[PDB]
């Protein structure tokens with residue numbers, strides 16, 4: 242038979258038992274309660290543990306990058322939840338969209354690039370996929386870098402709710418360091434780009 | 447860059463839809479459009495769970511990182527395993543500073559006594575559906591003493607500590623073996639600033 246998969250952690254998916262899932266509140270996004278038992282590091286089985294989980298979904302995130310002009314296209318839009326801990330709820334972000342049945346991360350990213358920023362992506366490349374806050378939410382965001390021509394930017398579909406900004410990669414990175422760009426998807430994407438722009442520029446050359 | 451501020455948004459109401467360990471709130475508001483007019487009323491369901499203090503344990507002398515392992519059941523449906531490799535992290539309670547929480551949780555979750563500490567970055571995990579803000583700090587630790595299982599008994603935290611070189615942790619992030627936001631952000635930051643940090647502390 243097959244050998245088991247290698248894991249970087251101690252226990253795998255088979256070492257936990259999801260006893261039950263109950264909806265605590267059902268709205269656009271449901272807040273659920275998971276009842277489960279899992280192996281402890283000391284070898285013993287746990288009691289039943291209960292956790293409230295915000296079932297948010299799965300998102301596609303696209304970093305529009307122009308390797309020739311070394312620029313990034315950012316979108317400005319309001320994220321009301323940022324109101325209580327930010328100076329302004331209008332954030333500079335990446336192209337993004339929720340992924341539904343039968344859709345791929347790439348399909349959503351390309352479609353969002355057109356709807357939100359009026360950009361037509363060329364080559365795309367998988368970057369990273371992260372869990373926004375796994376202690377309380379199931380959300381998972383997959384990031385891809387999209388090859389674009391920043392000339393075609395700076396009139397898009399959602400132009401009254403979304404404003405497009407074309408800036409140098411270095412300017413964008415600087416804003417992250419200064420804390421002027423602080424939403425997870427953007428920070429991760431821009432740090433990744435700052436760590437890999439040369440190779441990506443040569444790859445797409 | 448951004449020009450619209452809080453005066454460009456009219457929060458009509460914030461209602462509590464659900465209140466348990468965490469709360470679920472509804473925001474009813476109007477916000478200005480990029481054509482200058484005000485939007486119709488908009489509703490958004492927001493997950494309110496407080497704010498977090500995150501600590502990246504870094505040994506400048508050995509160039510190693512201390513990671514903690516623990517199960518996060520919310521990762522079950524989209525991950526290969528619910529047990530994640532993460533940074534020390536705690537919920538900031540009533541009037542506690544990011545530093546107090548980060549240093550306290552480091553003892554609690556990993557039994558590490560952090561020496562010098564430095565702020566890193568503060569981010570919003572997902573401004574679209576949650577108000578959560580996580581503030582990351584890097585803490586100087588002696589990795590040769592980091593070990594074993596920890597976590598608070600009364601909270602029922604079962605946490606195991608792992609010590610790996612900084613390069614490995616960074617490669618695991620680019621490889622998707624560490625993929626929770628706080629850890630990814632903290633480790634890419636470390637990879638971008640490790641030489642300057644070693645120079646300062648080592």
Ligand SMILES: Nc1ncnc2c1ncn2[C@@H]1O[C@H](COP(=O)(O)CP(=O)(O)OC[C@H]2O[C@H](O)[C@H](O)[C@@H]2O)[C@@H](O)[C@H]1O
Nearest residue numbers: 291292293294374375376377467498535536537601602603
């Ligand atoms: N889903 C939940 N429902 C009910 N009780 C819960 C839930 N999550 C955690 N708790 C309770 O809080 C303790 C964790 O305390 P912190 O240690 O004080 C906090 P920590 O878990 O670490 O969260 C900090 C950051 O790490 C994760 O990524 C989170 O998303 C967050 O951004 C757990 O032992 C448990 O008792």
Ligand SMILES: [Cl-]
Nearest residue numbers: 246253254526
């Ligand atoms: Cl498997």
Ligand SMILES: [Mg+2]
Nearest residue numbers: 534535536555
């Ligand atoms: Mg914790």
Ligand SMILES: [Mg+2]
Nearest residue numbers: 535536537551
């Ligand atoms: Mg705590």
Ligand SMILES: [Mg+2]
Nearest residue numbers: 535536551555
């Ligand atoms: Mg804790």
